[PDB]
């Protein structure tokens, strides 16, 4: 669907870090590890929360209805 | 579906009192108090503070079922020492320690940067 | 009383919100309807994982 607003485990906000993350992958050409590290996701639960997520809404917006 | 309301964990129900003091029939000069709408957060602290009182023979809390937010606290003090006074002294001690801790944290915070 | 009831009831055990209602004729020219109801389910004690 869309990037989860907050991490399930701890509760840290991660929804505001999605686009940025993507930028860190395509703009600065970083690996996922460093990209996640720069966003302040030290605990691997949030790190998971962003790395593991699949943005499905971008495929959902392809329909006209 | 059959899940209870969330506020039932901290909001007292209809007729439910906060503390239920009951004379213990087992050992003499003992008491069992039922704390409603409270969990380990309060029980563990109070029980641990009751053990500091050297005029308290016994002090133990327990949560009979995790479904219900409540816990029983058994206190046994020496003769000539009402257990309610032990509970009150424990509570006031807790409050004083927390106040001092708060003040110290506040003074230590003002000396920081960034 | 010149009519018999043929109304469709919501599931006795279920509940939710009417997500979308579809009205369309059939191949034989029969007006038929599909009503989709949406219900968000939250993991409860007893859910299989």
């Amino acid at each position: 669907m869309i990037v989860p607003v907050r991490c399930f485990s701890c509760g840290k906000v991660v929804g505001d870090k999605w686009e940025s993350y993507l930028n860190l992958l395509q703009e600065d050409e970083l690996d996922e590890g460093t990209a996640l590290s720069r966003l302040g996701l030290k605990r691997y639960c949030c790190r998971r929360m962003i790395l593991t997520h699949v943005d499905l809404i971008e495929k959902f917006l392809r329909y006209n209805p | 579906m059959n899940a209870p309301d969330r506020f039932e964990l901290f909001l007292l129900g209809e007729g439910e009192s906060k503390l239920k003091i009951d004379p213990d029939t087992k050992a003499p000069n003992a008491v069992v108090i039922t704390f409603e709408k409270e969990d380990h957060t309060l029980g563990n602290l109070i029980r641990a503070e009751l053990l500091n009182d050297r005029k308290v023979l016994f002090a133990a809390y327990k949560v009979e079922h995790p479904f219900f937010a409540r816990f029983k606290l058994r206190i046994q003090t020496t003769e000539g020492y009402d257990p309610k006074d032990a509970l009150k002294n424990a509570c006031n001690s807790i409050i004083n320690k927390l106040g001092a801790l708060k003040t110290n944290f506040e003074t230590e915070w003002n000396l920081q940067t960034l | 009383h010149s009519k018999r009831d043929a109304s469709t009831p919501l599931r006795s055990t279920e509940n939710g919100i009417v997500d979308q209602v579809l009205v369309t004729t059939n191949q034989d020219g029969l007006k038929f309807v599909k009503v989709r109801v949406r219900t968000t389910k939250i993991p409860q004690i007893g859910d299989k994982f």
């Binding site: 971008e58 | 009192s17 503390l19 602290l45 320690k97 915070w109 920081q112 | -």
Partner: protein, 266 residues
């Protein structure tokens, strides 16, 4: 002062790394529990949807709005809707903020938390404002609209406790560690060969003295030094997170004391 002591090792807008000295284990644990759950915070509790032609479901979006971190600075001069003598909600208990989004450009139109507009009267109280720790200043990515998709709704935010729902959680993860050298022996380390080489050494080990093999086990020692790191989400500043944590614990103890005071009635 005279009782427990604090030593702020690190401090920031989001985190506070400190050391609690002269404290019982139960008090530190209880403080942690209070900081995690029992702290008043403002968050979206009610959502009224007018038009929603976006991909996401109604209660989906609603759930996403519920987790939005709102300003809870002057939350203590706000009131619970259950306590307020009004109907449903008012300006003394709740903060109402609207949301009107519509697909304009051919490209994807993003709907953030900044798009939330406060409608109710705040009357001088620093409250309701959605926290934006974002660098671009957008905030939480709420939804995505196509070209003709429209999202029109209203949000009534009410004072709540994280014990009722984690959306009212003022803090994220709280780091907690006592006795890094296991001198109390509260933990029997699992191993295959060498117990010390396999298990990583904690940072807090730099703040205590290592055990001597010539010395026996100290059986009369308890737990005094506690290493904590409190992290806030944004709704309430860290210092105020631990401070209002302390105040909440103290207050709910005072409620029990008051109950004892009241049970003396015939």
């Amino acid at each position: 002062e005279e009782g427990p002591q604090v030593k702020i090792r690190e401090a920031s807008k989001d985190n506070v790394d400190f050391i609690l000295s002269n404290v019982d284990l139960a008090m530190a644990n209880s403080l942690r529990r209070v900081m995690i759950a029992e702290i008043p915070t403002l968050a979206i509790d009610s959502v009224e949807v007018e038009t929603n032609t976006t991909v996401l479901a109604d209660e989906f979006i609603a759930h996403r709005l519920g987790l939005i971190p709102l300003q809870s600075m002057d939350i203590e001069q706000l009131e619970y809707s259950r306590d307020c003598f009004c109907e449903d909600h008012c300006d003394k208990c709740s903060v109402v903020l609207t949301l009107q989004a519509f697909g304009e450009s051919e490209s994807t139109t993003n709907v953030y938390s900044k798009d939330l507009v406060i409608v109710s009267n705040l009357m001088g109280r620093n409250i309701g404002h959605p926290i934006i720790q974002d660098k671009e200043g957008n905030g939480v990515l709420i939804c995505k609209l196509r070209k003709g998709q429209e999202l029109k709704l209203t949000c009534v935010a009410k004072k709540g406790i994280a014990k009722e729902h984690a959306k009212w959680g003022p803090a994220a993860a709280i780091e907690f560690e006592y006795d890094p050298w296991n001198k109390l022996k509260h933990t029997d380390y699992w191993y295959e060969q060498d117990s010390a080489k396999e298990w990583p050494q904690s940072k807090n080990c730099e703040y205590e003295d290592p055990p001597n093999e010539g010395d026996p086990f100290d059986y009369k020692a308890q737990a005094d030094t506690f290493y904590m790191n409190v992290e806030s989400v944004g709704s309430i500043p860290v210092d105020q997170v631990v401070v209002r944590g302390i105040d909440t614990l103290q207050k709910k103890v005072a409620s029990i004391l008051l109950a004892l005071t009241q049970m003396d009635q015939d």
